[PDB]
Design an enzyme around this catalytic site. Structure first.
Site, PDB file in Angstrom:
ATOM      1  CG  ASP A 165       6.669 -14.555  -9.015  1.00  0.00           C
ATOM      2  OD1 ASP A 165       6.088 -13.942  -9.930  1.00  0.00           O
ATOM      3  OD2 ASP A 165       7.874 -14.374  -8.723  1.00  0.00           O
ATOM      4  CB  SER A 175      -1.135  -6.395 -25.224  1.00  0.00           C
ATOM      5  OG  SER A 175      -2.272  -5.554 -25.261  1.00  0.00           O
TER       6      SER A 175
END
EC number: 3.4.23.22
Length: 330
Positions: free
Chosen positions: A35, A199
């Site tokens: 994770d 992004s």
């Protein structure tokens, strides 16, 4: 040194991925959920409340000649999905894919929430976010990667998750045969303890690319792609009959649909998520309403590039002095 381990989807939907991990001496192999959105290595154990264990493999520290109680240390964690676990702490030898760390903090669960109990395939979590998020008190502990880093050939790990197929976590090297083209690297902020990056935009299907900054985290422990409501609405508007359902808890779509792809930007590069990756199947057995793999982050407080996004790429988690993230197509 290096390590290389195969990671395997737990079910036919790729809800999560498990990777075998050797703990203790002799080795006890547990299948852990790696994770990159948390920083605790915790396991089901001989200390876990018996009624909260249902099929998991447990770590038994008393059977490990290298286990030592970390005296006075406790831990307690709550995840974004509302699940939680807590317990005490041992140090022991932990190996992943041939890479060994001695003195790793292994957090032994005394209690786990229902979602963990109900998932017989996940024996615990191995956190790969920054150690500043580790919950051990009163002495915070380091992640497996942080402990291994100085010994690694290069201070990196990579995630290569498969779509309905096994993939690979590598430590200490970049497998140049595992991706196509070049890797595009992008800046990371560690201010919130995550692999947080921005992004450069998105496209829906064959549509034009929208240049827009989307801050979010690269999180292998989250199944879906969670993005701003504007972006998510633009995606699902291209699917006839798709709608947001408050009763179901997100966007659903007719199972008869063909889903468009979704592209996200990494600098000037583009990662394309095929439409099929966005299908999470019937909302309940036999239903013709299917659950979407792109969902709104509104009210999470952060955008999350979970498995839906990451499995479309070869992803480099660069833990150099100034960390960065790399993405390549594959």
């Amino acid at each position: 040194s290096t390590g290389s381990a195969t990671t395997t989807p737990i079910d036919s939907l790729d809800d999560a991925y498990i990777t075998p991990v050797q703990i203790g001496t002799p080795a006890q192999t547990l299948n852990l959920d790696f994770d990159t959105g948390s920083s605790d290595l915790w396991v089901f154990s001989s200390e876990t409340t018996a009624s909260e264990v249902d099929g998991q493999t447990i770590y038994t520290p008393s059977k490990s000649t290298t286990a030592k109680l970390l005296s006075g240390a406790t831990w307690s964690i709550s995840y974004g999905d509302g699940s939680s676990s807590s317990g005490d702490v041992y140090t022991d030898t932990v190996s992943v894919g041939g890479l060994t760390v001695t003195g790793q903090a292994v957090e032994s669960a005394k209690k786990v929430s229902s979602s963990f109990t109900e998932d017989s395939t996940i024996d615990g979590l191995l956190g790969l976010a920054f150690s500043t998020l580790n919950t051990v008190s009163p002495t915070q502990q380091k992640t497996f990667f942080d402990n291994a880093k100085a010994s690694l050939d290069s201070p990196v790990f990579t995630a290569d998750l498969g779509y309905h197929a096994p993939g690979t976590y590598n430590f200490g090297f970049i497998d140049t045969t595992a991706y196509t083209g070049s890797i595009t690297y992008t800046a990371v902020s560690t201010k919130q303890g995550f692999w947080e990056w921005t992004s450069t935009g998105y496209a829906v299907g064959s549509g034009t690319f929208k240049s827009t900054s989307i801050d979010g985290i690269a999180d292998t422990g989250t199944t879906l792609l969670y993005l701003p409501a504007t972006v998510v609405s633009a995606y699902w508007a291209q699917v006839s009959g798709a709608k947001s359902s408050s009763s179901v808890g997100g966007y659903v779509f007719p199972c008869s649909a063909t889903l468009p792809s979704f592209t996200f930007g990494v600098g000037s590069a583009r990662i394309v998520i095929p439409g099929d990756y966005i299908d999470f199947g019937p909302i309940s057995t036999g239903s013709s309403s299917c659950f979407g793999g792109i969902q709104s982050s509104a009210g999470i407080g952060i955008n999350i590039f979970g498995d839906v996004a990451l499995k479309a790429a070869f992803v480099v988690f660069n833990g150099a002095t100034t960390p960065t993230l790399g993405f390549a197509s594959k």
